[model samples]
Target chain A: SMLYVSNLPVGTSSSAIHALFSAYGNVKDIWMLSPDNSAIVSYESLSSAIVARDALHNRPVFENHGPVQVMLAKPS
Target chain B: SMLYVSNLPVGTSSSAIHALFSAYGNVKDIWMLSPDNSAIVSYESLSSAIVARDALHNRPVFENHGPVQVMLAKPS
Candidate 1:
């Protein structure tokens, strides 16, 4: 499955983000966009990750932080 | 198909990784975990990226940066 996250702090560490989403399921890989902190995380399966993302989707991870957007990637 | 990458310096850009791997093929997306400095990148297809990643699998793109791991994301 595919996941997209944005509005991350300019310098947030990759591990920090990993841990936040790790509880959802097995995170295979993560990447930060060049010149930006936005990321797309891929999972082995979409079920658990989808659940976790929906729980916190549009909620601030921290004070003054923008909401995270989560949605399923186009099905193959 | 699946790809596994490890040992990256903290705070690498998706675009930079994409740029390096971009030469090999089309990039589908990029992401980095918040808590970890490590990353995982996904390409539209494994063939081109595989070629590029394998070419520099053990070479250091920059000082202090560890080698990148590349493989298929595990066929569904």
Candidate 2:
């Protein structure tokens, strides 16, 4: 499953976001969406995405945008 | 909006979950789903639901069910 992360710090780089989710499991890809200030992160497995989402959703790790919003992305 | 919460401890009562979300805003109703170990929590408004969902999602406050899974419920 892919996870949608929103409200990341305006200048948060892909690598930084990757590092955040990588701590949980293998990250497959990341899509940074502008204007909306959000990104999509794909994990290798559904269980990995579930664990990461359950553990890191709305976590305040970064300044101002630390508490990033995370949810399962709607099927494409 | 209604939030779906899953992976609650085997016998968690409705009131316990209520208190957890009550800290954020008015909880309209809660539906505990059997066999799946899940519940649905409804808020008065979408903004309220967003705040509560972003703030309290995946918080490990209880014994084993502390890090409950919270997500927006598909509209009926």
Candidate 3:
């Protein structure tokens, strides 16, 4: 995911984050950091994911997972 | 459904409205005005639809559609 949601709890998993994205639309994939500061994951194209984000942003993915800020890349 | 979307141009169909909601989640049904007075329809549970509304509201559906306001019932 080009969007990196920081401040996520230490145990936050990619699948868990994917579920949050899934509520809006189909998710290609997500990457979770393993106590490191560098990581990357792809989820279709920026446009596709943006469409998904437009629908899902600000909406809750899971109950316990409180407001995870949305990270959006600049439109190309 | 406790949500009411207004300012829709005339000739907008129920299918169009459903498509808008479908981007967020399952839509039970929709009611469109026929250039008349009043109408009412069901759209699953209020909570569930509100969830859907929160996701889809303000997101563009078709290129032609602009902004669609969401009317939500107060939570129980």
Query: What DockQ values do the models have?
Result: 0.05, 0.02, 0.01
Error of 2 at B18 (Å): 37
TM-score pick, better of 1 and 2: 1
RMSD list, candidates in order: 10.8, 11.7, 17.0
Report the backbone clash tally of model 3. 1
Reference-based lDDT, residue A50, model 1:
79
Q: Which candidate has the top score in TM-score?
A: 1
lDDT of 3 by residue, B35-60 (tens): 32111223566666667657756766
Better of 1 and 3 by TM-score: 1
lDDT of residue B51 for candidate 1: 83
Name the DockQ score for candidate 2.
0.02
Query: lDDT per prediction?
Result: 0.62, 0.72, 0.50
Candidate 1 C-alpha lDDT tens digits along B24-62: 777666655423444456677768656866787777764
User: Model 3: residues >4 Å from true position, as ranges?
Assistant: A1-76, B36-41, B74-76
- Which DockQ-derived CAPRI band holds candidate 1? incorrect
Strongest candidate by lDDT:
2
Count of backbone clashes, every candidate in sequence: 29, 2, 1
